[PDB]
Amino acid sequence: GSRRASVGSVRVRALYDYEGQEQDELSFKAGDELTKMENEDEQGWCKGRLDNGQVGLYPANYVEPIQ
DSSP, X not given: OOGGXXXXXXXXXXXXXXXXXXXXXXXXXXXXXXXXXXXXXXTSEEEEEOSSSOEEEEEGGGEEEOO
């Protein structure tokens, strides 16, 4: 067994740049890496962890899955 079999963290790649609007949001550029920690909401948003280490919401429509 390995961490690839788990479902509590999914690495994802930023499609485009984004900048957080509250203390519970994150900021990244086109081609950055981040970590999804929660499912997509009814609005098309997720909650994850950043390359610097911060934790917050971001639009799930600005990322794609890594394999």
